[PDB]
Subunit: 389 residues, 4 copies
């Protein structure tokens, strides 16, 4: 192949069309489907795949008991053909661990998995199916990364990683990879106070990462990365439309340079947005408290305008159904003259919200932009929890 | 590859030989087989595949309960290697939705899935494995399409779609795609009064679609499409041999220009015919009332002669067994100097005819033409419903 | 590719080494393994595959009940990667039917399946994955063919087919195929009185088929086919070592030109031999009455010497275990200067010999020649029938 | 491809990073996973695969009963994509038997399986997927080989095999293969007193095999092989750090030229080391008595210095968990200027240590060297044996 260069702008988006849905929990009620969480999608020149962190057991298996827990030696990053549900028979092991990112540079895939004990974790960086670089924890407190795809440009693939408290100031770094080797590392700079779980996309030779502040803000940090110069800046999303969970009600003015506090009971969830002037879209859970529902809001100049509000709206998952993490991806190899925004929603089933079962797992739904004004309906998980009792 | 051009005539057919049978319900009694309905086949230069609309569950799974229902967020168009039964392990997700068509232009496959709410559904058109076009509902009442393969000629792949009432006049359009993009759209014209579920095939640079009139006629509408001029005409199958279900008795004279009414209790079923002067074959269910049995009748000049009758007869599924939808396909890439007709029959098991189970699904049988005079037997589903009680 | 020509002689064989074993019944006690019978193997330039006639159900499925029966619309020829057990997930459907043969001509595979009712069955001949020729029953009584591989030479692949009584004179024909088209058909001629289930191999531009006389002989018929001249002759295997089942004791003299009668209670079983002068090997069941045990006997000049006996002996399946059909195959594309003989044994389990279960199925073992004098042990099926009760 | 030449030295190793983990026993509690033991890994130019000896049954199947037994006609060497668990659906049968080795020469894979009765076993040597050579037992007492990968150089792939007593002097040979054909055979020479189960790796045009003395020594034999001259020498690992199991306490001085006796109750376990001057690493079970736990010890000049001790430690499996066999492999086709050491640990579950179940099987974990000083945690099997009772 040839290296991906982010030469195209973003496509105009007026609504979202269905891309894929795996129905993994419905199917997994009776087929051999593995337990997962923290899914995402990532494309390459030959097609798009689903990704997630396995828990090393099937959904109906006795080892599904206790899968609310996030980190163990039995987790792995696995990928599979888009739309299928993940089984022990159709999944490729990308790397071993409990926090991950992956992206394709046009020639080969880079996958990163972090594993080990909380006080001394390590990333193993794979390129082209081999391991090539290892990175020790720098702060001794749950070294962790994006939980969705990275983005490459001219062979440089920046990745955002954090080590340190989840509830206080941490140590975040931007690592610039080439063939899975470190070309440059930067300490986080700018106004973002805390960085977790960045959802990133590229357009017009720049990468934007929309992340989770788990310490203070209900507004999301935004890291802007120049992959050719290998530099970054950070701020908060300016818009008054708040998109973390938990969050307070939308205030009259957002904040660019500082967190907006508030919300109960949880400090954060992975999410995303596409920031392109008038062509800007913010995703968020419908509930301001819980990971329930999911909606897309078109918010012109969300990135720069503190009073920017929504001019259009699409419900992706109604508020009577559980959502979860969400993130950005793009098919950078599509036959279009612009890069078309896509996103996924993790549809979490089981604990803590559904305590009648002993497990936690998820299914996936993914959508991409349309220039049309399409009708829509809810793409919820669809499984009956009673069937699992 | 190279673009398919429909340069060949149809082959002479004197009987039908067995092509494939998946035995899906027998196998699915104990293996992990997904619930489907609305199956078909479609070929490409490398081989032929089975296609159908999944229900997002396995046959033995608890979520099989309730699958009589036609439209949900859990359905998708899936394809698999011809002859296998469809499982979560061997199926490719073509697109997401509850009404579909698919065809190959010699270079790439186009697959179309319609999804969303009845009052605001949308088609997503995929080409080469990517989404390329979206079409919103134009009449706000269950946007829907062929449920068997489309046909391509010189890169133009016409598709018949309907939006509007199932029991009254609707809005049908002929959409001419190239690389999944719309080149032309036409409103239905001609004598056909209602168009559903067209079964199409190509020969000598023309495409014929034999459809289902769900409003009035027990004779089938025929849409004739010229793919290079991107124009069409429509009328009814002239023959007194009536081939919808339900239908009345075959009258003394058919009708070319109007529906022949009658039949109880059902308004229609998807079906097909091959219309080629003396070399013409009509399929229909054996029962005039119910989707039971299936027979092929050789009816010379069926397309044009209101007094045409059967000169030969093959029972495909005996009338002590359930059939279902039926449709046309051809392997346009065969090593023959003519295009040989093929068809499938959907073998529906479970509800509503078999109410001892909670689910509805099917298996598939497919046959192609022979110039020989072959013996034959019934190719029914073969599952024992008592085993599922 | 390039056409296979039978330019090499047979390899010297002094003992037999293990090639493959699928353990299908053992595995199928808990995994999704399909019920089969009449297995065989066949190679192509890329590798060797296993083949068999499916019954359209898994072994543990309720539809395994009644699989003692030989002919149904639910049977298919399937192939899979050598050594795996056949499941709904790893098997390729070659053609649909209840009697089959298949061979690769160096460029593409020809597969033939016969289906239909006993009085009007038909063969469908596939080449390169596509059906190309159909053959109607010529005698109205179970048209049937080899149940192991055919052999090709310079693009010509002869096949032996029989139509007519199983217990009286029948009508056998040798059909010479090219790209699955009939180039020539001959009626059986020579001294063989009844021909079933031929096991064929090629060497030095000639093909030999060792068959089953189900009418009279306990000695096996041998059809010698010249593929370039498209002619054949037939006789009986001359040796006194009788190799049908059931059979009487080996007499002081065999017969070349007529059947040796005797044996109780069964009229025949599919089997094979390699006939190469001093380098000749005969397979047979160990039991003279039942399909129990399996042994190889080196019988120099078996083909021509009525007094030939065994000079060496290898037990393949001990006589405390069930065997079944057996047949010849060769990897004609190996990197050797001679063609090495291989064979398989079908290890039949269930009915009629094991009536505590409701099903009949088999596993497979395959071996090839060695010039070494290797040690050996029994390669019996290995499943515990008590586990299935 | 091109022949692999061992032109590179070993990479510097200061700690070990996780490469793969299949979690086979956790998954196999409910999915169709085959029972195995004696696993390893081996790479080729396209990637790395897991290998092991199947027992011809699934873990949950009733035929899992009795799998503590090591040799049967139902075992085979199978391979699968690294990281997946082994099922009947994702495994390639390499050859049939109960002792194996496999390695890739840059062009094709050589796989060797031994089968047959204890007094008359035979090796079948496969190359490029075909059988090419057979080797009869030379001493009539359990002909057996490495149970981990061989190593190739310039098309020569030496393999160590033993025939004879497990508890007294045996007859070991070094067999030099090229395209699976024997180029040279040597009787074992040098100071090693008993050789089993060698773990081999290549560097700087030489091969080192670290084996198991089952007769006398708790120190491990080391065979040094020159693949281009096709010669070898043998001695013992000099270091006082003893790495067989069972073993006594580490003494003040090791022994180069003789076994160190002692230890209770078991005579040996397969193991490995990387011997590269200062860059030397030894693995062993943590327990001196039992196959429990696993640790890596960096022991400079372990190969030459009888007083060499550990300068660094990493626990791979804690001593509250079962281990098993362990062995060396390297991705010789990696994009590095050195060959990086890797190893696996077999994690044995069930009998004899866990007698609440009727079966014996394992999962696998594999790690490779890092120049970093990484943190670490235990990579134990992770299955709950209570779930299987
Ligand atoms: C992207 O740019 C790089 C130089 O930075 C170039 O080598 C590569 O060919 C480009 N990729 C394509 C697809 O043009
Ligand atoms: C689930 O795991 C918990 C904690 O390890 C244990 O106490 C409980 O018995 C398990 N429950 C089941 C149903 O296996
Ligand atoms: C079919 O016609 C198209 C366009 O007219 C041409 O480009 C193509 O090569 C033709 N196909 C073949 C197989 O010749
Ligand atoms: C089937 O679905 C109906 C409707 O939701 C439900 O009430 C019923 O209990 C279900 N039956 C079973 C056996 O799950
Ligand atoms: C075999 O002979 C055929 C026809 O006699 C010839 O065309 C072909 O080239 C030969 N095949 C090989 C592999 O030499
Ligand atoms: C097996 O099939 C026979 C014959 O159809 C039937 O009478 C019997 O009920 C079946 N047994 C089981 C256990 O399904
Ligand atoms: C390894 O050496 C062999 C023979 O000495 C040579 O033919 C081969 O090309 C070499 N391999 C590479 C990758 O250069
Ligand atoms: C396990 O196998 C043993 C040995 O043959 C047998 O005695 C026992 O009955 C078997 N147990 C089960 C539960 O099948
Ligand atoms: Ca927050
Ligand atoms: Ca009608
Ligand atoms: Ca006989
Ligand atoms: Ca020892």
């Amino acid at each position: 192949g040839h290296l991906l260069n982010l030469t195209k702008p973003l496509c105009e988006v007026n609504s979202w069309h269905i891309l894929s849905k795996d129905n993994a929990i419905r199917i997994g009620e009776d087929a051999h489907i593995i337990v997962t969480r923290e899914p995402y999608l990532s494309c390459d020149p030959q097609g798009c795949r689903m990704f997630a962190l396995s828990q090393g057991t099937t959904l109906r298996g006795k080892h599904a008991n206790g899968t609310i827990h996030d980190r163990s030696p039995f987790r792995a990053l696995v990928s599979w053909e888009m739309g299928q549900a993940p089984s022990p028979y159709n999944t490729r092991v990308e790397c071993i661990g409990w926090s991950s990112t992956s992206c394709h540079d046009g020639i080969s895939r880079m996958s990163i998995c972090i594993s080990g004990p909380n006080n001394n974790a390590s990333a193993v960086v794979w390129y082209g199916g081999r391991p090539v670089t290892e990175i020790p924890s720098w702060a001794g407190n749950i070294l962790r990364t994006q939980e969705s795809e990275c983005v490459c440009h001219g062979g440089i693939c920046p990745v955002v990683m954090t080590d340190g408290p989840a509830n206080n100031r941490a140590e975040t770094k931007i690592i610039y990879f080439k063939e899975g080797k470190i070309k440059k590392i930067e300490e986080l700079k700018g106004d973002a106070q805390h960085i977790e779980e960045c959802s990133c996309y590229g357009a017009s030779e720049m990468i934007k990462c929309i992340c989770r502040d788990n310490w203070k803000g209900a507004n999301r940090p935004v890291i802007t990365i120049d992959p050719e110069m290998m530099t970054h800046t950070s701020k908060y999303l300016c818009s008054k439309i708040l998109t973390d969970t938990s969050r307070p009600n939308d205030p009259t003015n957002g904040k660019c340079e500082a967190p907006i506090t508030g919300g109960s009971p949880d400090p954060g969830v992975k999410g995303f947005a596409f920031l392109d002037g008038e062509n800007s879209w913010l995703g968020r859970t419908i509930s301001k408290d819980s990971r329930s529902g999911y909606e897309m809001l078109k918010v012109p100049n969300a990135e720069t305008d503190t009073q920017s509000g929504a001019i259009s709206h699409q419900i992706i998952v109604n508020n009577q159904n559980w959502s979860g993490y969400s993130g950005a991806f793009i098919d950078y190899w599509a036959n279009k003259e612009c890069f078309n925004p896509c996103f996924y929603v993790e549809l979490i089933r089981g604990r803590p919200k559904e305590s009648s079962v002993l497990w936690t797992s998820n299914s996936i739904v993914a959508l991409c932009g349309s220039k049309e004004r399409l009708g829509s309906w809810s793409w919820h998980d669809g499984a009956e929890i009673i069937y699992f009792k």
